[PDB]
């Protein structure tokens, strides 16, 4: 099989720059017909590739300007002349010329976008919960960049820990950001032992941290 | 008009067999050659084989071989994809897709159905609101949403008011619980003044046993 290596592995680029990708085959994808069939793909989260050039430099239907692609023999680059917010994902090189055909193992695109700190929101559990036996408390962190934002729960002071759990999404391509969320899960009898329910949150957009808290039954 | 239309979710033990469906719709299903694309953790994406919608044959993928039959139905314009004696490694989303200029790309795909391989019980969430309260304000932005948590295996997906409330949403990837279960959440952003006369529902929908929770998030009173 034809091994298809991108280069780099992520990129990351800053608002208004544009962006290259390489593409790498082991072998010639030179099709019997005479052509190259040479293709890239980008590919969000959770959501079905989407075709972006086709043949190595042909720019497919609805695609817009700013993407192109170029490359001869084995060597095949995808360019983006300024980065939108939507160009975040993953790209991904593919040769259709010899079978089996093979795909790249991607390229991950970040938007280095201004340091954004985040707003922060708390949520107690809900009623409906309270009465399972279980009770789980959310923090939310919401478009904030850089994506390491530490979240640290705190039990009247006590900072806990082994009960929570948390996500971060993937790059928002709308404004550049990230968000997170983060659980704290306790049983019933665990959850009626404490009264502040706090997280911290420390981040390179907040001088200091922030502490988003409720007092249980308030 | 062109659609794919596929499965979404699988759950099978292992040395089991799935057939994966494609519903074509939009489009002559003998017009294009049916593509089946395989996306593992790992291996990364992979295509399968193609198979001839006229005579019903497929070129395969040698790996797949065998252990991947892609059929064609013509009297339901449905291809398939049938795994056999599955294993873990074989836990991966699985699409099918066309083209439409010759062998030139793939401009269509469908959404992809979630294989697992698992001897687990396929298992439904619960969908706890995340009430929007004092406690959850940032200069005339309200937060809310919705926790869903407890169920096996993946994937849920969750939309706000039937795809109508888009702008603001956040659905967090699951997190693996010490229970063996998943659980995930989705937020949105909106405006704190509108909260007594607005209606915001998440809409859940746990793929492998097809559960489908419309959930009202109700303002909390603190
Ligand atoms: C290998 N193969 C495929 C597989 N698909 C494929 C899609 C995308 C890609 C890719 N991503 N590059 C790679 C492969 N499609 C093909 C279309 C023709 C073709 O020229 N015709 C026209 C003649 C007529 O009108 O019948 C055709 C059209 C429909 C049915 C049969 N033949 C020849 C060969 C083909």
């Known amino acids: 099989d034809i091994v298809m290596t991108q280069t780099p592995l992520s990129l990351s680029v800053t608002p208004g720059q544009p962006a290259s990708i390489s593409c790498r085959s082991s072998?010639?994808?030179?099709?019997?017909?005479?052509?190259?069939?040479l293709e890239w793909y980008l590919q969000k989260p959770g959501q079905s590739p989407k075709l972006l050039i086709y043949?190595?430099?042909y720019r497919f239907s609805g695609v817009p300007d700013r993407f192109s692609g170029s490359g001869s023999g084995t060597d095949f680059t995808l360019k983006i002349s300024r980065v939108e917010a939507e160009d975040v994902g993953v790209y991904y090189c593919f040769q259709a010329s010899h079978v089996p055909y093979t795909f790249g193992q991607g390229t991950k695109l970040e938007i280095k976008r201004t340091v954004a700190a985040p707003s922060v929101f708390i949520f107690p559990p809900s009623d409906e919960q309270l009465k399972s036996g279980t009770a789980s408390v959310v923090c939310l962190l919401n478009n904030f960049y850089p994506r390491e934002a530490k979240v640290q729960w705190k039990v009247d002071n006590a900072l806990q820990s082994g009960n929570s759990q948390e996500s971060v999404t993937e790059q928002d391509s709308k404004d550049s950001t990230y968000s997170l969320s983060s659980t704290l899960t306790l049983s019933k009898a665990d959850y009626e032992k404490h009264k502040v329910y706090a997280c911290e949150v420390t981040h390179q957009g907040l001088s200091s941290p922030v502490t988003k808290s409720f007092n249980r039954g308030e | 008009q062109v659609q794919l239309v596929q499965s979404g979710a699988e759950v099978k033990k292992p040395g089991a067999s799935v057939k994966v469906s494609c519903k074509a719709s939009?489009?002559?299903?003998?017009?294009?050659?049916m593509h089946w694309v395989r996306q593992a953790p790992g291996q990364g994406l992979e295509w399968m084989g193609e198979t001839n919608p006229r005579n019903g044959g497929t070129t395969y993928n040698e790996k797949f071989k065998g252990k991947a039959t892609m059929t064609r139905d013509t009297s339901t314009s449905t291809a398939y994809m049938e795994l056999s004696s599955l294993r873990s490694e074989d836990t991966a989303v699985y699409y099918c897709?066309?083209?439409?200029?010759?062998?030139?790309?793939?401009?269509?795909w469908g959404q992809g159905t979630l294989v697992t391989v698992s001897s687990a019980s396929t298992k439904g969430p619960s969908v706890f609101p995340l009430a929007p309260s004092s406690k959850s304000t940032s200069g005339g932005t309200a937060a809310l949403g919705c926790l869903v948590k407890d169920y096996f295996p993946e994937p849920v997906t969750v939309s706000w008011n039937s795809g109508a409330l888009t702008s603001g949403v956040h659905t967090f990837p699951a997190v693996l619980q010490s229970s063996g279960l998943y659980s995930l959440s989705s937020v949105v952003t909106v405006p704190s003044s509108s909260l007594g006369t607005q209606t915001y529902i998440c809409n859940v929908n746990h793929k492998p046993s097809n559960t489908k929770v419309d959930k009202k998030v109700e303002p909390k009173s603190c």
């Open positions: 043949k190595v430099s």
């Open positions: 072998q010639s994808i030179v099709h019997s017909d005479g052509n190259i069939y």
């Open positions: 939009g489009y002559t299903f003998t017009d294009y050659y």
């Open positions: 897709t066309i083209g439409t200029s010759g062998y030139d790309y793939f401009d269509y």
